Amino acid sequence: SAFITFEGPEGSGKTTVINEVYHRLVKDYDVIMTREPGGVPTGEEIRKIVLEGNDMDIRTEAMLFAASRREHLVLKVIPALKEGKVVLCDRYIDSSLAYQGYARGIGVEEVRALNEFAINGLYPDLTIYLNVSAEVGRERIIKNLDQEDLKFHEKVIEGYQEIIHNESQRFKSVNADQPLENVVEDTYQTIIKYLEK
Ligand X SMILES: Cc1cn([C@H]2C[C@H](N=[N+]=[N-])[C@@H](COP(=O)(O)O)O2)c(=O)[nH]c1=O
Query: Residues at the annotated binding site for ATP?
Result: 8-15
DSSP β-bridge partners for residue 7: 129
Cβ count within 10 A of residue 59: 14
Identity of the residue numbered 54: N
Give dist(CA 140, CA 189) in Å, integer.
24
H/E run at residue 94: helix 93-96
Beta-bridge partners for 175: 131
**# chain residues binding a second copy, by CB under 8 A:** 25
Distance (Å, whole) CA 16 – CA 27 = 18
DSSP 55: S
Q: Which stretch binds ligand X (CB under 6 A): 95-103, 131-139, 171-179, 185-193?
A: 95-103
Q: For ligand X, which residue of 65, 102, 171, 188 counts as binding (CB under 6 A)?
A: 65
Among positions 5, 34, 96, 131, the unique one binding ligand X when judged by CB under 6 A = 96
Q: Give the shortest CB-180-to-ligand X separation in angstroms.
A: 16
18-77 residues near a second copy, rule: CB under 8 A: 41-42, 45-46, 49, 52-53, 56-57, 59-60, 62-64, 66-67, 70-71, 74
We find the least distance from the C-beta atom of residue 46 to a second copy, in angstroms, to be: 6
DSSP secondary structure code for residue 123 in this structure: -
Query: 56, 104 in Cβ contact below 8 A?
Result: no
What are the residues binding ligand X (CB under 6 A)? 9-10, 36, 65, 90-91, 95-96, 99-100
What are the residues binding a second copy (CB under 8 A)? 41-42, 45-46, 49, 52-53, 56-57, 59-60, 62-64, 66-67, 70-71, 74, 110, 113-114, 117-118, 120
